Amino acid sequence: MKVHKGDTVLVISGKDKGAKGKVLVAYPDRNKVLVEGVNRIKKHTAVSGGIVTQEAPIHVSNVMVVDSDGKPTRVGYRIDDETGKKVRIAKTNGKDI
RNA sequence: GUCAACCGAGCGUUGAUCCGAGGAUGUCCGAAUGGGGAAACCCGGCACGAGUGAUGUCGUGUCACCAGGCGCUGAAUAUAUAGGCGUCUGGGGGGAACGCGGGGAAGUGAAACAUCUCAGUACCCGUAGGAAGAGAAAACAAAAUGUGAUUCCGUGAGUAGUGG
RNA sequence: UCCGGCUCUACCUGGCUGGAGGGCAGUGAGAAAAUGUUGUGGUUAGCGGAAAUGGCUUGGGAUGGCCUGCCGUAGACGGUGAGAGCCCGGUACGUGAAAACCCGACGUCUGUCUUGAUGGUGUUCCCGAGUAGCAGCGGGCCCGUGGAAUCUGCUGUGAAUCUGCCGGGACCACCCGGUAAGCCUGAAUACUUCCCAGUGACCGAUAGCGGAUUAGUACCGUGAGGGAAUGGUGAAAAGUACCCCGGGAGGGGAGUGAAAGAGUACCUGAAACCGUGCGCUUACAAUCCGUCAGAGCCCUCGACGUGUCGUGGGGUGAUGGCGUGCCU
RNA sequence: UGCAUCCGGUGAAGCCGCCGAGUGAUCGAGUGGUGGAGGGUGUGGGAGUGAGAAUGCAGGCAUGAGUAGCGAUUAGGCAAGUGAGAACCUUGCCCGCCGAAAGACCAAGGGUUCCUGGGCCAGGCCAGUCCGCCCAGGGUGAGUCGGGACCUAAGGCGAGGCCG
Ligand SMILES: [Mg+2]
Ligand SMILES: [Mg+2]
Ligand SMILES: [Mg+2]
Ligand SMILES: [Mg+2]
Ligand SMILES: [Mg+2]
Ligand SMILES: [Mg+2]
Ligand SMILES: [Mg+2]
Ligand SMILES: [Mg+2]
Ligand SMILES: [Mg+2]
Ligand SMILES: [Mg+2]
Ligand SMILES: [Mg+2]
Ligand SMILES: [Mg+2]
Ligand SMILES: [Mg+2]
Ligand SMILES: [Mg+2]
Ligand SMILES: [Mg+2]
Ligand SMILES: [Mg+2]
Ligand SMILES: [Mg+2]
Ligand SMILES: [Mg+2]
Ligand SMILES: [Mg+2]
Ligand SMILES: [Mg+2]
Ligand SMILES: [Mg+2]
Ligand SMILES: [Mg+2]
Ligand SMILES: [Mg+2]
Ligand SMILES: [Mg+2]
Ligand SMILES: [Mg+2]
Ligand SMILES: [Mg+2]
Ligand SMILES: [Mg+2]
Ligand SMILES: [Mg+2]
Ligand SMILES: [Mg+2]
Ligand SMILES: [Mg+2]
Ligand SMILES: [Mg+2]
Ligand SMILES: [Mg+2]
Ligand SMILES: [Mg+2]
Ligand SMILES: [Mg+2]
Ligand SMILES: [Mg+2]
Ligand SMILES: [Mg+2]
Ligand SMILES: [Mg+2]
Ligand SMILES: [Mg+2]
Ligand SMILES: [Mg+2]
Ligand SMILES: [Mg+2]
Ligand SMILES: [Mg+2]
Ligand SMILES: [Mg+2]
Ligand SMILES: [Mg+2]
Ligand SMILES: [Mg+2]
Ligand SMILES: [Mg+2]
Ligand SMILES: [Mg+2]
Ligand SMILES: [Mg+2]
Ligand SMILES: [Mg+2]
Ligand SMILES: [Mg+2]
Ligand SMILES: [Mg+2]
Ligand SMILES: [Mg+2]
Ligand SMILES: [Mg+2]
Ligand SMILES: [Mg+2]
Ligand SMILES: [Mg+2]
Ligand SMILES: [Mg+2]
Ligand SMILES: [Mg+2]
Ligand SMILES: [Mg+2]
Ligand SMILES: [Mg+2]
Ligand SMILES: [Mg+2]
Ligand SMILES: [Mg+2]
Ligand SMILES: [Mg+2]
Ligand SMILES: [Mg+2]
Ligand SMILES: [Mg+2]
Ligand SMILES: [Mg+2]
Ligand SMILES: [Mg+2]
């Protein structure tokens, strides 16, 4: 779905614009992803209970994958004649990911 | 799956969940169809297996009504029939409207009111279908040596007519 | 074309049925049952599907404002922190089904018939009966007995079969035109509980279906039946750690957040309504509660000094003139 | 709705004020404070288009007013305990009342109102530690009692049948 677990994504819209991070969990039922080190929020818990800062999810539409050349890019798909596997495309240059 | 989260356990690179096709599973009531009954609950007959010292006990199946046939039987009785069985195939109930068909009213208008109107409308009932119904003139027409099944549109026309 | 057997037997002429071969067509309303299958046809679900991190500004957050460049056979649509074709779902376009199912042909196999068919000169028991029509009684055709055809039918009656019938709007003659009492047969048409895709000068929570929410629920009625009210925190739960008052509820701080006069009784929060405070009025006053005058006090503003003028204001209103709400 | 297309997060609509202007219904590229997402000049077009009345409808809030009433004829006082608070609850002492009930069992009926534990917003016509409140847990043990295995009345259903 152009955004998977463990990828490298760059935030487009949001207070923590321009940061980088990994993908921890995807909420495809809600299309809302969670990225460590981005969109840092605070929380209050009363069980041991303190001001625990936790990571909140973002809409995937506000994030995108960054190519190895440090250039964020859309995603494209191919069908591998060798095995028929649908792979990623660095849309600007169409490499493999 | 959701409320709803949450955990807790956990599942996946061999491809788990997710979607689609076919299949199996489907307790009980419910046309209910083994009998009965206050629905979701009581009570049996028959055939095969199993366990107990045996019974007790267990599972599985089958067991309505009507219609139409088939085989067997046959009461008054003599022939034969009714009835009696047993077996195959159908139907049984539900569903918004539409269609057909059997039946079918008053409020109302008439400035009252019966004829009349309201109207063969509402409603009830029995049918099928995806449509139905109607359908190949015993029809019209009017001297033309004309039309040529049914059905549905717009006309013809609120005209000919009908009506205390 | 041929073969056989018949019209109670065997031998010319005449009238039928059965078998070898061109038909009639067939899942058919006019013969019945069987014999089996190919469209990138569609349906059931799917795949790809272009082109800005572009930069700066306000900005919480940009899709926004400005500047460039973008692609488009795709600038319908939805979402993302505010108006997004160049961010995602996706849009044109392309593509695709192992299996099953609805609509389209094609070689096993089946029936029939060519004992039947087409064209030419004269004399002698069949083709819809309790039916057509009739007397009475009623019904449907615009037609209510009216002068009343045609149709149907309840009861009694009841016909001809070709020089037969029935219709031609009472009814009759010549002629004029079409076969009743048996049967079936697609297309044009009506409808939508159900599904899909699209659209609306249709509503936007007292509207709109009764029902955007546990709704045909709560509830009412024993019954048939009736039948409600009740949407929005935030972009995201980040739903108020911790401290203090109090038993808690409730509340005040602290933090979250752009905002907590967004705190879950949660957008906006009006009016009736009930308060606090402030300025002024009111305890000799007879009444649709105002209007016209109108001093005083309060505050406001400019020319001008301590308050007086000035084409002065707003609030109050002491007192007096007039004054009998509104709709029917 | 149509439009040249614009207005606006440098604050739209909406709300509450103020100012000025039109003879009116109003208007203001007119603004101050809340609000934080849409409005729309002009010219047409179409309307569920303008509310005070209808003993209108639905919702909210008024007043009579902190007034009437707090639901019997049996009736209490007090000690101590719990608790923040104690007439109203727990324990104790006395008093009173029913005692063919105002006691004890069932049927019909209701269905967790039974017991234990916790808390008192909401409910109890007041407070309430209490409750028939709410929250959690527990609780119903039958060959011999009762309803089916049995039979039947009134009556209901009813194969065939009769009539419609
Ligand atoms: Mg399947
Ligand atoms: Mg299937
Ligand atoms: Mg099974
Ligand atoms: Mg039964
Ligand atoms: Mg049965
Ligand atoms: Mg038979
Ligand atoms: Mg006999
Ligand atoms: Mg049937
Ligand atoms: Mg009348
Ligand atoms: Mg009249
Ligand atoms: Mg009438
Ligand atoms: Mg009529
Ligand atoms: Mg059919
Ligand atoms: Mg037909
Ligand atoms: Mg006409
Ligand atoms: Mg795709
Ligand atoms: Mg900026
Ligand atoms: Mg832009
Ligand atoms: Mg612009
Ligand atoms: Mg668009
Ligand atoms: Mg948009
Ligand atoms: Mg997007
Ligand atoms: Mg008449
Ligand atoms: Mg006549
Ligand atoms: Mg004829
Ligand atoms: Mg016929
Ligand atoms: Mg048709
Ligand atoms: Mg509203
Ligand atoms: Mg009831
Ligand atoms: Mg802050
Ligand atoms: Mg409120
Ligand atoms: Mg609000
Ligand atoms: Mg005063
Ligand atoms: Mg005085
Ligand atoms: Mg006087
Ligand atoms: Mg007065
Ligand atoms: Mg006066
Ligand atoms: Mg006076
Ligand atoms: Mg703003
Ligand atoms: Mg503002
Ligand atoms: Mg403004
Ligand atoms: Mg706002
Ligand atoms: Mg607007
Ligand atoms: Mg216009
Ligand atoms: Mg206009
Ligand atoms: Mg109106
Ligand atoms: Mg009003
Ligand atoms: Mg009025
Ligand atoms: Mg009124
Ligand atoms: Mg009152
Ligand atoms: Mg009093
Ligand atoms: Mg009193
Ligand atoms: Mg009482
Ligand atoms: Mg006490
Ligand atoms: Mg006594
Ligand atoms: Mg007694
Ligand atoms: Mg006694
Ligand atoms: Mg009882
Ligand atoms: Mg009971
Ligand atoms: Mg108790
Ligand atoms: Mg307790
Ligand atoms: Mg309490
Ligand atoms: Mg109460
Ligand atoms: Mg409880
Ligand atoms: Mg019977």
Side-chain angles (χ1 to χ4, degrees), chain A residues 63-81:
Chain A
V63 317
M64 69 183 291
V65 60
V66 70
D67 286 309
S68 46
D69 64 0
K71 300 306 304 301
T73 279
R74 293 188 288 304
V75 183
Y77 282 165
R78 256 96 57 82
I79 292 177
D80 180 76
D81 297 331

Side-chain angles (χ1 to χ4, degrees), chain A residues 2-22:
Chain A
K2 285 194 284 287
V3 179
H4 292 78
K5 167 54 170 149
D7 321 330
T8 321
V9 199
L10 158 53
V11 316
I12 308 74
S13 52
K15 73 162 150 302
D16 203 318
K17 195 169 314 312
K20 289 172 107 83
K22 304 288 84 184

Side-chain angles (χ1 to χ4, degrees), chain A residues 6-95:
Chain A
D7 321 330
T8 321
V9 199
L10 158 53
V11 316
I12 308 74
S13 52
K15 73 162 150 302
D16 203 318
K17 195 169 314 312
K20 289 172 107 83
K22 304 288 84 184
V23 177
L24 271 77
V25 294
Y27 299 178
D29 210 359
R30 327 186 177 164
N31 302 116
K32 176 197 301 323
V33 75
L34 163 155
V35 201
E36 81 310 329
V38 286
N39 155 253
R40 198 78 185 77
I41 50 162
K42 300 194 184 103
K43 169 65 76 177
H44 313 102
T45 58
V47 179
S48 69
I51 297 87
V52 48
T53 68
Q54 190 267 333
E55 291 326 278
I58 312 313
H59 260 57
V60 47
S61 179
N62 324 297
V63 317
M64 69 183 291
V65 60
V66 70
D67 286 309
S68 46
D69 64 0
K71 300 306 304 301
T73 279
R74 293 188 288 304
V75 183
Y77 282 165
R78 256 96 57 82
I79 292 177
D80 180 76
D81 297 331
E82 313 167 346
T83 302
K85 312 344 300 172
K86 305 335 166 71
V87 305
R88 325 304 180 65
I89 298 172
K91 186 64 66 67
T92 88
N93 62 23
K95 45 211 192 191

